Write a protein that binds this ligand. Structure first.
Ligand SMILES: *[C@@H]1[C@@H](O)[C@H](CO)[C@@H](O[C@H]2O[C@H](CO)[C@@H](O)[C@H](O)[C@H]2O)[C@H](O)[C@H]1O
Ligand SMILES: [Ca+2]
Ligand SMILES: [Cl-]
Length: 496
């Protein structure tokens, strides 16, 4: 469950948040395959509540109605078409599995659902599964409200309703079997693994019992006996009884401390600075690297949801964001996920975004196509961070340097730092309020290298900065604090 099952030499996944299946299929073929992306995290592919007040929020997809593969992203045929086309070009699909809960207990009964299935939250009736009152934790939860009230009580966090979401009785073999039926449908279609949503709200042993029911990956594309990649969403920022290490026997875990601390460092909050990153990894209190799924931001915390955190860097902070993503993609810790977002009309009042609910770009609720502009950016209000040169080229950097050790660290005691990945790549950052001009040991063979942040290697030439490495491995770097991107990255495949 710990291996991503990407093709050898592909080292990241991208979250194509709220994208339609047909657009992901095309993106696999036209971009993700040629640019070396390992795979795609898709939005939940199972039927959810259609919520009209407010109008079609992104978060309606975290309120299941059934396990029919029928959503605003597309139907089952479209989902299968996407998985097949992506696998055929060597780009994997990872499903966001919403298995802790069904919808909010106060949602009105009826057919306001993405496939028109009937459901009745008040009577605990989800006949398209089917689930009934016997399948929820009403009797097991001991809180006065029936909801989670106190995160210092690890039992209620698992047995009670997360903000009123009906909480499935995951101890029951029937419920475990209906979830495994859904997940095995997806595995047999060709999915390579799963994000397990709300894993903090599930007992480790119930997750294990569900995983024990899962198939190996589809043998038309994957070697015999391949286990689905599992990454469990556990928000563990250190101050609660539940520790994400309790989940290590099941799979990897999301390391939310990663982006929280990288954001505080890059924003220079509380006296933090990039020179402190020399011992980034477990030395910062993080999970073991081989159990970490890392990211700068995710779909929740880029808009203040989940545990939020004011330090989180997002595409709205483009310059610092590219730096943070670049540091993450160069550093060997963890398995990396890149975010890919849509723009919404963010509107802060008293420090909080009142439009944080707005769903994906749409016409009368129908999600808009992803359009591709001549310059390779996206239209229709899709941000497409994964197509920004500075991010795509660092996805490639990570592939090129895969397996090489962290070495040749330099810092100025403030915010000018650099490091190498064996003899295959080198990266230099200036987050101080003055210029960084210095000759550094790069660990690389002598030659001329294109900086893949300011430009590209194209037809035996560089379109941006060129770096000249001498016989001793040293090279001069110059980065103004006013540079568009105050970091430079070079690697074996950017050498002329
Ligand atoms: C995981 C999922 O467990 C979260 C809870 O459902 C989900 O949260 C979002 O959706 C819920 C339910 O619609 C909203 O109440 C929350 O405000 C919202 O953040 C996470 O997105 C998901 O990652
Ligand atoms: Ca639960
Ligand atoms: Cl996540």
């Amino acid at each position: 469950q710990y291996s991503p099952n990407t093709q050898q030499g592909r080292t990241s996944i991208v979250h194509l948040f709220e994208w339609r299946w047909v657009d992901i299929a095309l993106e696999c073929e036209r971009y993700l395959a040629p640019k070396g992306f390992g795979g795609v995290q898709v939005s939940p592919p199972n039927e959810n509540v259609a919520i009209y007040n407010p109008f079609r929020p992104w978060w309606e997809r975290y309120q299941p109605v059934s396990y029919k593969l029928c959503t605003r992203s597309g139907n089952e045929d479209e989902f299968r078409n996407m998985v097949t086309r992506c696998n055929n070009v060597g780009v994997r699909i990872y499903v966001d599995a919403v298995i802790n809960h069904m919808c909010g207990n106060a949602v009105s009964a009826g057919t306001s659902s993405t496939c028109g299935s009937y459901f009745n939250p008040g009577s605990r009736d989800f006949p398209a599964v089917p689930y009934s009152g016997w399948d929820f934790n009403d009797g097991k939860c001991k809180t006065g409200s029936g909801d989670i009230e106190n995160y210092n009580d690890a039992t209620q966090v698992r047995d009670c309703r997360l903000t009123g979401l009906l909480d499935l009785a995951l101890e029951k073999d029937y419920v475990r079997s209906k979830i495994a039926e859904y997940m095995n449908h997806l595995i047999d279609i060709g999915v390579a693994g799963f994000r397990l949503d709300a894993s903090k709200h599930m007992w480790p042993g119930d997750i294990k019992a569900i995983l024990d029911k899962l198939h190996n990956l589809n043998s038309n594309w994957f070697p015999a006996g391949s286990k689905p990649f599992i990454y469990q969403e556990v928000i563990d920022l250190g101050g609660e009884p539940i520790k994400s290490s309790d989940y290590f026997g099941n799979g990897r875990v999301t390391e939310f401390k990663y982006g929280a601390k990288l954001g505080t460092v890059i924003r220079k909050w509380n006296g933090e600075k990039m020179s402190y990153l020399k011992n980034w990894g477990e030395g910062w209190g993080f999970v073991p690297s081989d159990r970490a799924l890392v990211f700068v931001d995710n779909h929740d915390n880029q808009r203040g949801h989940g545990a939020g955190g004011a330090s989180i860097l997002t595409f709205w902070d483009a310059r610092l964001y590219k730096m943070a993503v670049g540091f993450m993609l160069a550093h060997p810790y963890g398995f990396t996920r890149v975010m890919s977002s849509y723009r919404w009309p963010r509107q802060f009042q008293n420090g909080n975004d009142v439009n944080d609910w707005v769903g994906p770009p749409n016409n009368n609720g129908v999600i808009k196509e992803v359009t591709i502009n001549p310059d390779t950016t996206c239209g229709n209000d899709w941000v497409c961070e994964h197509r920004w040169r500075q991010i795509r080229n660092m996805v490639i950097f990570r592939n090129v340097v895969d397996g090489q050790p962290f070495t040749n660290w330099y810092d100025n005691g403030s915010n000018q730092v650099a490091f190498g990945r064996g003899n295959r790549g080198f990266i230099v950052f200036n987050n101080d309020d003055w210029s960084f001009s210095l000759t550094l040991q790069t660990g690389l063979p002598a030659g001329t290298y294109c900086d893949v942040i300011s430009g590209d290697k194209i037809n035996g030439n560089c379109t941006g900065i060129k770096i000249y490495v001498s016989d001793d491995g040293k090279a001069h770097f110059s980065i103004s604090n006013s540079a568009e991107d105050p970091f430079i990255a070079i690697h074996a495949e950017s050498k002329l």
